[PDB]
Structure 1
Amino acid sequence: SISISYSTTYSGWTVADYLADWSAYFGDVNHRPGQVVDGSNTGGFNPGPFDGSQYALKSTASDAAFIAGGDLHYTLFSNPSHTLWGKLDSIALGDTLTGGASSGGYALDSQEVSFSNLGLDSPIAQGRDGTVHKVVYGLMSGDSSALQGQIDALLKAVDPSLSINSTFDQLAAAGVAHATPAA
């Protein structure tokens, strides 16, 4: 089932409130045709060049970054064009992306929250309507609605009393979340 790690800083936050705040702070890197002219808003795959166990993106407005983990693929120009698909197992949110394909992969200097065992799997044929694509592209473009909706559904599958309106401390009482010391 879904597993969550959170800095005790967010003990009393609801998951919905954390993710809305986090996406407002990360902003929109404007990964849009005509606005992607170099590597500052593309993100990166591990290993790449167009597939990876990780896809990571640094914010262009702040130090925020996220890391999507799983078995992910980007169609580039191939039909259906500009689709991120495959397996999305994890999302990590925090500050300061670090690493590369030869240095141990991607990580966050200050991870705040992570969502693991997401068990999302979108086939290429769903295109940009796939759940994985919408979840990750939402984060790229400053809109965590799709991620929130996916975390909501997984938490209710553990117990219908849980939801993205639960606090991290409540989810840890439920056994799904685990507090990490702040830093």
Structure 2
Amino acid sequence: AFSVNYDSSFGGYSIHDYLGQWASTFGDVNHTNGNVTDANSGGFYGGSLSGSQYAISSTANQVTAFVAGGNLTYTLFNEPAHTLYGQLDSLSFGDGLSGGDTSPYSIQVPDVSFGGLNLSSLQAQGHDGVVHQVVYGLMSGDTGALETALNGILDDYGLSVNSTFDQVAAATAVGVQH
């Protein structure tokens, strides 16, 4: 049940191509946004360290954000030690998070997102566990780990992170490659 959760308007990017564009704005410290009021940084939702959701906004400009969500667990007292693992299904890139009070973080300007990954890492999947990878990648403005995770569903149909927002969604819809 995977798909690209892009705002139905950008449906013509190669996944890796738009994600790079997201990181473009992410890296730029002076990048503001007139649509961004609150601009919440993140730091989980249903947990102090482990839980459901894990959002991150650009440490540079603290607008260009990323909402992660799955079934997380922070291994402080655990085996890998001070690491991340657990499940992952959906990402969500966009400018400026809001909420983070009584509601979960959500992008004020909701852009491309991800859903249906269904990737869960085992206990000892410390920094090598793709969920840990993708999150800290995202946090740093890297999509080079997410692209490889994305390839997990795409490769089943024969696509990749370089597949278009139309083709990915269509292939995960049913597959329209023939």
Q: TM-score, normalised by structure 2?
A: 0.80
Which residue of structure 1 lines up, in the alignment, with residue 148 of structure 2?
A: 149
Mark the CA change 1:81 to 1:167 in structure 2 (over 3 Å): closer, same or farther. same
Could you tell me how far 1:172 is from its partner in structure 2?
3.8
**Structure 2 residue matching 1:145: 3-state secondary structure:** coil
How many angstroms apart in 2 are the aligned matches of 1:175 and 1:141?
A: 28
Which residue of structure 2 lines up, in the alignment, with residue 38 of structure 1?
A: none
Which residue of structure 1 lines up, in the alignment, with residue 118 of structure 2?
A: 119
Could you tell me how far 1:124 is from its partner in structure 2?
2.1
Mark the CA change 1:109 to 1:167 in structure 2 (over 3 Å): closer, same or farther. same
Contact 1:71 1:87 in 2 (8 A): yes
TM-align CA RMSD: 2.4
Which residue of structure 1 lines up, in the alignment, with residue 165 of structure 2?
A: 168
Q: String of CA shifts for 1:91-125, please: whole Å, max 9, x gaps.
A: 0000111112x422111111111111111111221
* 2:97 maps to 1:71: no
The residue type paired with residue 146 of structure 1 is A
Which residue of structure 1 lines up, in the alignment, with residue 36 of structure 2?
A: none
**Structure 2 residue matching 1:164: 3-state secondary structure:** coil
Q: String of CA shifts for 1:59-84, please: whole Å, max 9, x gaps.
A: 12231111111111222365422211
- In the TM superposition, what are the counterparts of 1:29-40 in structure 2 within 5 Å? none
Which residue of structure 2 lines up, in the alignment, with residue 94 of structure 1?
A: 94
Could you tell me how far 1:11 is from its partner in structure 2?
2.2
Q: Which deviates more, 19-28 or 63-72?
A: 19-28
How many angstroms apart in 1 are the aligned matches of 2:79 and 2:72?
A: 16
Contact 1:15 1:164 in 2 (8 A): yes
Structure 1 alignment gaps of length 5 or more: 30-41, 178-183
Could you tell me how far 1:28 is from its partner in structure 2?
9.8
Identical-residue share of aligned pairs (%)? 51
Which residue of structure 1 lines up, in the alignment, with residue 38 of structure 2?
A: none
Could you tell me how far 1:43 is from its partner in structure 2?
4.1
The residue type paired with residue 98 of structure 1 is S
Contact 1:28 1:141 in 2 (8 A): no
The residue type paired with residue 148 of structure 1 is E
**Structure 2 residue matching 1:109: 3-state secondary structure:** strand
Q: TM-score, normalised by structure 1?
A: 0.78
The residue type paired with residue 110 of structure 1 is V
Could you tell me how far 1:25 is from its partner in structure 2?
2.6
Structure 1 residue runs of 4+, over 4 Å off? none
Structure 2 alignment gaps of length 5 or more: 30-40
How many angstroms apart in 2 are the aligned matches of 1:172 and 1:78?
A: 37
Q: String of CA shifts for 1:148-167, please: whole Å, max 9, x gaps.
A: 1111221121x11x222221
Mark the CA change 1:45 to 1:173 in structure 2 (over 3 Å): closer, same or farther. closer
Structure with the bigger percentage of strand: 1
Mark the CA change 1:54 to 1:149 in structure 2 (over 3 Å): closer, same or farther. same
The residue type paired with residue 87 of structure 1 is Q
